[PDB]
From a paper:
The BisI family of restriction endonucleases is unique in requiring multiple methylated or hydroxymethylated cytosine residues within a short recognition sequence (GCNGC), and in cleaving directly within this sequence, rather than at a distance. Both proteins are homodimeric, with each domain involved in target sequence recognition and catalysis.
As the crystals of the specific NhoI DNA complex diffracted far better than other crystals, the following structural description focuses largely on this complex. The DNA in the NhoI–DNA complex is bound in both orientations that are compatible with the 2-fold symmetry of the enzyme. This does not compromise the electron density for the base pairs that follow the two-fold symmetry, i.e. of the external and internal G:5mC pairs. The external 5mC, and the paired guanine, do not form a single direct hydrogen bond with the protein. Instead, there are only water mediated hydrogen bonds from the proximal subunit on the major groove side (Thr144, Ser137), and from the distal subunit to the minor groove side (Asn42, Ser65). In NhoI, the pocket for an external methyl group (GCNG5mC) is formed by the proximal enzyme subunit, namely by the Cβ of Ser98 and the side chain of Arg84, with the side chain of Gln96 only slightly further apart. For both NhoI and Eco15I, these are a histidine and a valine of the distal subunit (His139 and Val140 in NhoI). In NhoI, a guanidino group of an arginine residue nearby (Arg101 of the proximal NhoI subunit) also contributes to the internal methyl binding pocket.
Residue numbers in the entry:
A (entry chain B): 13 to 168
B (entry chain A): 12 to 169
Amino acid sequence: LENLTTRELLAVSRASLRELKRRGVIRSGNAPAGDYAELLVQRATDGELANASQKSWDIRTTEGDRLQVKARVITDEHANGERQLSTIRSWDFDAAVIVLFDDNFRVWRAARVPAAIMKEAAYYSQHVRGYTVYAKDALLNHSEVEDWTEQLRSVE
Amino acid sequence: NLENLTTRELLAVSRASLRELKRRGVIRSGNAPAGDYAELLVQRATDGELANASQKSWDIRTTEGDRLQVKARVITDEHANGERQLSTIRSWDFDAAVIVLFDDNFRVWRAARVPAAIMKEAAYYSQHVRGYTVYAKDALLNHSEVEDWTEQLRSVEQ
DNA sequence: CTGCAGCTC
DNA sequence: GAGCTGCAG
Ligand SMILES: [Ca+2]
Ligand SMILES: [Ca+2]
């Protein structure tokens, strides 16, 4: 992409978003990671996608589980800051599904974390009125956490 | 043509374009490019100093000392009220906001310098996020105390 | 920990 | 109004 002008680079950024939405891979104007991670969890659970602005959770599974999906793109597996999950303002869900992409947007690691374990790992931020969880290796490897890496790779 | 690419190739191109924009200094973060790119245009237009990326309240200090809070949206529908909603404001310690409205090809469509006091008048509080919401509606853009910066920003995009 | 733009109805 | 994901020091 080094041969493209900056104007073309910005246009490719928008056009790729537009084509992804046309294919139903994403459904919003956000950067694709959030919607794409939800799509994969939906495929893996055969679940029901919630309304985009619904509070608390994103996907309801066939067995009735309410899943809060949280994704990050990892460019440096040793950068703790890239493990910071998007803020949590409501605990009315059954489990979080953490989806860690590599910088080619391939699934690197995924984990199903019970809500109670998420709460135990959370720190409150008064600035944003919400809770921060870090998807550090210790949480991903927690004895009550399920490794979902292969389950999400099989739906990529 | 992107319609000929596999979904895997599309996603990789999404990352690759972000990486190339950061390598060139057009952006300086892994966010979607709009936020950093709007700050870059305002910096080019004011010859100002970029604040630290995690700095509270403002983004750019002008040579004359104005602390500018840059707020951008990419407009796909010029008549859509929701697309004027600016990112939340949790601190009023800035002198003026610079609103940058892009079109869906990432060209500058409209830009405006809004005094902080006018931003405060238009804001509604959201207890859910502990912040203030301002909409870049035409009435705000056309306010008598708002400066049109569209041509300034257009002269520095490439 | 402190913050920012994951890092629409 | 109610909400979401406009990632960094
Ligand atoms: Ca989510
Ligand atoms: Ca800003």
